[PDB]
Design a protein around this ligand. Structure first.
Ligand SMILES: [Fe+2]
Ligand SMILES: [Fe+2]
Ligand SMILES: [Fe+2]
Ligand SMILES: [Fe+2]
Ligand SMILES: [Fe+2]
Ligand SMILES: [Fe+2]
Ligand SMILES: [Fe+2]
Ligand SMILES: [Fe+2]
Ligand SMILES: [Fe+2]
Ligand SMILES: [Fe+2]
Ligand SMILES: [Fe+2]
Ligand SMILES: [Fe+2]
Ligand SMILES: [Fe+2]
Ligand SMILES: [Fe+2]
Ligand SMILES: [Fe+2]
Ligand SMILES: [Fe+2]
Ligand SMILES: [Fe+2]
Ligand SMILES: [Fe+2]
Ligand SMILES: [Fe+2]
Ligand SMILES: [Fe+2]
Ligand SMILES: [Fe+2]
Ligand SMILES: [Fe+2]
Ligand SMILES: [Fe+2]
Ligand SMILES: [Fe+2]
Ligand SMILES: [Fe+2]
Ligand SMILES: [Fe+2]
Ligand SMILES: [Fe+2]
Ligand SMILES: [Fe+2]
Ligand SMILES: [Fe+2]
Ligand SMILES: [Fe+2]
Ligand SMILES: [Fe+2]
Ligand SMILES: [Fe+2]
Ligand SMILES: [Fe+2]
Ligand SMILES: [Fe+2]
Ligand SMILES: [Fe+2]
Ligand SMILES: [Fe+2]
Ligand SMILES: [Fe+2]
Ligand SMILES: [Fe+2]
Ligand SMILES: [Fe+2]
Ligand SMILES: [Fe+2]
Ligand SMILES: [Fe+2]
Ligand SMILES: [Fe+2]
Ligand SMILES: [Fe+2]
Ligand SMILES: [Fe+2]
Ligand SMILES: [Fe+2]
Ligand SMILES: [Fe+2]
Ligand SMILES: [Fe+2]
Lengths: 155, 155, 155, 155, 155, 155, 155, 155, 155, 155, 155, 155
């Protein structure tokens, strides 16, 4: 059945490509946060284990919402290790850093998602896709708040 | 008591006129979805009876939110068969279609409401009314997601 | 598949006709109550906004129950503005009356539904349809309690 | 202690006998529904596994209510395979039918309980046992609604 | 405002008089049950303290439903010691009986409410007051189930 | 089994006598508040119906707590119309006053219970019954708060 | 689709045969417990009514778990009176025993289910089926705990 | 740790200064609303006591959300009487007005917060701070809806 | 950090010593109650198993509240078998009494805690430690109520 | 309507003056706690952000309870920045202290509220106002518990 | 601090290595299931969207449980795309298969996890690690049940 | 009534002796954890107070489960200070250690319970008691997980 939501095929494709980068960043941050939840040690273990648990639980919902916006636009949502490694701007950590370095990496991760979201608004200006713009705004709000709570631990 | 929310009376009347069409479309789609919920038959009965129930339940809240935004702008909210029949662009179904035609009609219904919402943004861009713009964006998000789920059944 | 519930087809059709009138009245009262919920003003705004919310919330469930009893009897449930205007004995209000007149109209609405319910019982005795008779009885109970609560506001 | 509820011992015994048949039918349908819940296969597995779960869960409560009405009338409630096999009008299925045949058998099962309930009303009329009449009416309502939901899957 | 629910003023007044006796009996049983809840002793203390608690909790809701049916019929609901002592057929217990006598009096109390309820049906036959008839039937169901549970303790 | 809670039998008997009057006053107020809940009319029906429901719901718990304190002191708790009519200082209303007069009466009821509670404190001075003193204090707190909310309606 | 869970088809059939006897025993105990719940009398009625309710509620869930393990092994789950009478080792009670005898029979029933579970482990040691062994262990744990609670009543 | 969220330091400082004013105005309206909740009297006491409770409860959450957006921007959130008095544009009420004047003041307060929110948008346009824009929009929607509910009481 | 709560160090030390005896008694009663919960047998098993469960569950919270009041006064809370055995006035039961003797011992236990609480008030009066006096009062209320429920089982 | 709660007008005014100082201290501590919740940084951010949230959430309920006790005594509750700055003994912090200094200040704040409550008991002794004394006691309990938890963080 | 749980370090490392493969397989199945949840189309969309959501929700909890068992054994839990691609035996699907192929792949995935779990038991028989064996058994139970539900759709 | 669960009396006694030592160790660790919960201080207070609270809450359930397995085996569950001091291998802490030493002692306590559980398996290998083996396994799983969480704080 044809899709008639006021956005043309090539524009929906370009928006889906941007949201695919956002999905890949968000999913990579999800797994990194889950990883640090398991692997963090030292005197802040209790609070960081819990904090990273809240963060990855929220990111699991965000992954679903971003993916299903791609579906609403008429395209398949990427969902493999290869697709996400190709699209993600977040570099993974293959070892076990000190807790302060875990916090710093997760701050940079929040900012990377924000940076990807910001890269998409120019396209949305040209096209007028208010639902996707609101999604991006919600994600920016969450990552900017989380960035504050994480960097506050360092000071 | 004078209303002083930063929008003049005839500008508020114009936004309320557009929201009245959005309300009438939303309410007509609500009754149609409720109708199909009761009347659908065939092997997809259980899943469509449930899917349509979730949709009309969400629409009943949306009708209330759209109507109370009209009130916040200082105008009466329309609420009769005659008023909605006059304002609605949704085509009503007087008989009992087969399930796949019910699904098709509801997809077109979602897209019709999006179109009505999209028609109001030019006005908000002249007058500046960010709360209504957010309301319209939420309706477009819900209806575009619902159109994906519905049309996915026909693939 | 044949329907063997102990009521013949012609009697099931006659009961469904009566329930179609009850459904149309109930749905018309639902919309009128919802209308007054949005549009009432004056010193009793808070209490009537709330009271009318409770009533239309209940009536939305009642619509579903009546329509699904029609389905159980083997007939399509009506669900359009045209069908309900043809069948309803409640007169819609196209303006915005004063609060006391809103209350008075809703009292009369409760009593109109009771009247339609009473009209159906003679048919049910002849054919013994105990489930439909209990449904009618429940509606009369709800509308007669609601009539008391509304008319108490006038005194 | 004597039982003085406005119904003589012989009439209570006769009503208890009728309810024993209703209980046996309801319990046999309960087990058949539970059986089909485990054993159904094919593309409708997810919907029918869930639908039959809802139905057997409701029937388990109904068995308790019918049995406890027998106890309120002053007689023991039957509760063995031999007693239910002797009293039940529902034939059990010893194999694993196709899903559509499972649906058909459950429709007939609903109608068999309705038929048993109908057969008890004459006694209740001659004797004025309003609580039992209301129990029978509630069972007829549930089974007639369930029959509609089931046979709609076959259209 | 006029009351047009299909029952004449003289008949509504006679039904309200019957419900007043039922209200009085139910409230007197409520207090007696609450009394025994406090004052029962011996090895069955824990079970009877709890069982009587469940019973008086249910009766408090019943008194409200009975009183508000009187109000729906257009008459004030009685609510004083003097009014209830004049209308109640339940004899109060001024001392502290043994647990077994407490149980036996509560059985008789259930049966007294049933008896008062049965006395009202003839009036409802000539008049067609279905909601009141259903209320009476509900009370009869509850009191006959409670009578079975209480007298079972004595066996 | 002897009671050894640090209060001799004569003092326990005197405290119980005082609590017996507090119980009768609390229960009388409970029934009066319940009565006004049913019978109030006029433009304040909705808010007074609800307010009086909250009050009688709280009073029902208070009755149980006061009676059980009497039980803990070693004496039976009174629970009959004749006992409460004898022990109570609260005047019952046998008719249906106007709403403003219902409010006034309930204000005077709250203050009467406070007076009855106040009358018991001297017995506890002598004896050091700290649990009873806390129960009286809580009743005074509730009733003084309720008196403010009620009389605030009259200003 | 072919089943590849690491257990050959005839070995799965043998485990399913053992679980079918366990299912038949558990379901027979379920119906006996339900029967005694309705029919027990005497001074222990309240506590046994409740205790047996808790037991049959647990057993209803265990029946579903056992049946679905048979399904996971690739075989139909038996579910008729004839099948369960054939496969069960627990004998039903066709009359109404005294309460102490009901308790004794339920103790023996718990122990019968333990014995049936035990009888299956030799097969599992040969074949290796750790999920089934864990299910059997859970049923032994529940039935041994329940036997303690039941026989404690008789001491 | 550097803040890299796509908004330079001077722009973040300016937005935080604007939100500091929104925070002060929101907290001042919070305390005024809480004040009127305690201090309102007259026949609308119940409805206004409840209505103003809902409002100050929502405002307390809004205070936290606005302050934490300031934190996300990298600046301290003000939170003292001196700071809020200095930053607020709403004037406090030091006495106890009549209920209609309390309503009027709270309507004006809603509109004053809307004005403070409006004053911040010019700054976000230049900079593109989509999360803050959404926050201002949410506050405008809540205050404009609340203004409608309050001013409806005066009509 | 100095402690400045209006009570000098020596008086706080003396209050903490008294609360240490109350904590020891309460913890010893908690373990005894938990013991009898496991070990009681006979026809009251179900009721005493449940009643003792409610009691020990409440006592667990009380232990925490007493200990933390000691901490608030500035002293370590005792928490070992030797500390509690040294301070406790409750004598432990090393065997398995009959149920009636378990009930009697638990009555005496409630009274032992009350006795210990009464021994502390003189100190509190001389010093005005109102929070500790309220804690003692709440413990006395619970234990005197529990003593009533337990001894009522014996009568 | 006269206030007759057993405390004379001048004494109620004096008690209300003391509670006004308590309210002002509690509200000032509420805002200081809210402030530190937003502004704290360093490795203890997570634990202190959450601890201070729990504290200000509880203080918000306490401010309402203290204010409504003032109302129950017949006096208006103060509720402005100026009224609280005049009455409060807590000095506000206009900057952003180190986390350890925030904790120290919050300890001193709990003790300041305790000191204000203690200053009122002499008056209450002369007048006899048990509800107010119980409220002060509860505040002292909460603040002394909170002081222990806070000062424990320093050790 | 040394780990002394009764298993030597290289034996724990070997168990951790096996569980790392189980974790990688579970996580790969999790993402594949989430992918298919987003991307499935056709008439089974509604039921497969729901079924796959329930599955990936369960798998997300299982990932955490398996990772935290690795942590309990004293080893870091892997958690990157590169590690999971290296350790997994399940192949991802890079395209969008038809619904029946999605079902078949998820059946094969359940069976793949069972094989990986099964492959670890030989090590557990040499070393003895009953907690890990119970985790493996739980995963086998879940995946075998899920395989039945999935393959039933293809029958 | 004889116990027939497939284990001979002296074999059950031996299993119950082992579980009695596990119960004593679990209860000793419970009290030590509760003690440290009250008495810990320093910058980790908030996290350790909460962490130790979660642990002692879980242990309280474990104590009940272990004791009631002893009861299912037909033996009394020990429950006094003297019995637990005799049976326990965990030593109590009579003073107030620094937080890091509290953590270290609780790690050692978790490992002690694991050793006690492990010590019972040789017996169960001779006797066969799968329910007890599963209980031991669950305790080993919980204590090994808790040991990781605790020792992670010391890294
Ligand atoms: Fe965790
Ligand atoms: Fe989803
Ligand atoms: Fe938004
Ligand atoms: Fe204009
Ligand atoms: Fe439905
Ligand atoms: Fe609304
Ligand atoms: Fe939004
Ligand atoms: Fe939006
Ligand atoms: Fe609303
Ligand atoms: Fe429906
Ligand atoms: Fe009914
Ligand atoms: Fe009904
Ligand atoms: Fe299932
Ligand atoms: Fe039952
Ligand atoms: Fe029952
Ligand atoms: Fe009914
Ligand atoms: Fe009670
Ligand atoms: Fe009511
Ligand atoms: Fe009924
Ligand atoms: Fe009913
Ligand atoms: Fe009501
Ligand atoms: Fe009670
Ligand atoms: Fe108190
Ligand atoms: Fe208190
Ligand atoms: Fe084989
Ligand atoms: Fe199932
Ligand atoms: Fe297990
Ligand atoms: Fe096992
Ligand atoms: Fe309030
Ligand atoms: Fe916050
Ligand atoms: Fe928004
Ligand atoms: Fe605690
Ligand atoms: Fe926060
Ligand atoms: Fe309040
Ligand atoms: Fe208190
Ligand atoms: Fe090795
Ligand atoms: Fe979804
Ligand atoms: Fe975790
Ligand atoms: Fe296992
Ligand atoms: Fe397990
Ligand atoms: Fe397992
Ligand atoms: Fe042996
Ligand atoms: Fe605590
Ligand atoms: Fe237990
Ligand atoms: Fe238990
Ligand atoms: Fe296990
Ligand atoms: Fe195991």
């Amino acid at each position: 059945m044809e899709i008639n939501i006021g956005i043309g095929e090539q524009d929906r494709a370009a928006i889906a490509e941007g949201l695919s980068r956002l999905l890949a960043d968000t999913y990579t941050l999800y797994l990194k946060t889950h990883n640090f939840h398991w692997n963090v040690t030292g005197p802040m273990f209790n609070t960081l284990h819990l904090m990273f648990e809240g963060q990855y639980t929220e990111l699991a919902v965000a992954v679903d919402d971003i993916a299903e916006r791609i579906r609403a636009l008429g395209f398949p949502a990427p969902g493999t290790y290869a697709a996400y490694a190709r699209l993600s701007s977040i570099k993974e950590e293959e070892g076990v850093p000190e807790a302060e370095e875990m916090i710093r990496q997760l701050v940079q991760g929040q900012e990377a998602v924000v940076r990807t979201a910001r890269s998409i608004f120019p396209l949305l200006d040209k096209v007028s896709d208010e639902p996707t713009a609101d999604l991006l705004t919600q994600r920016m709000q969450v990552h900017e708040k989380t960035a504050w709570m994480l960097r506050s631990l360092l000071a």
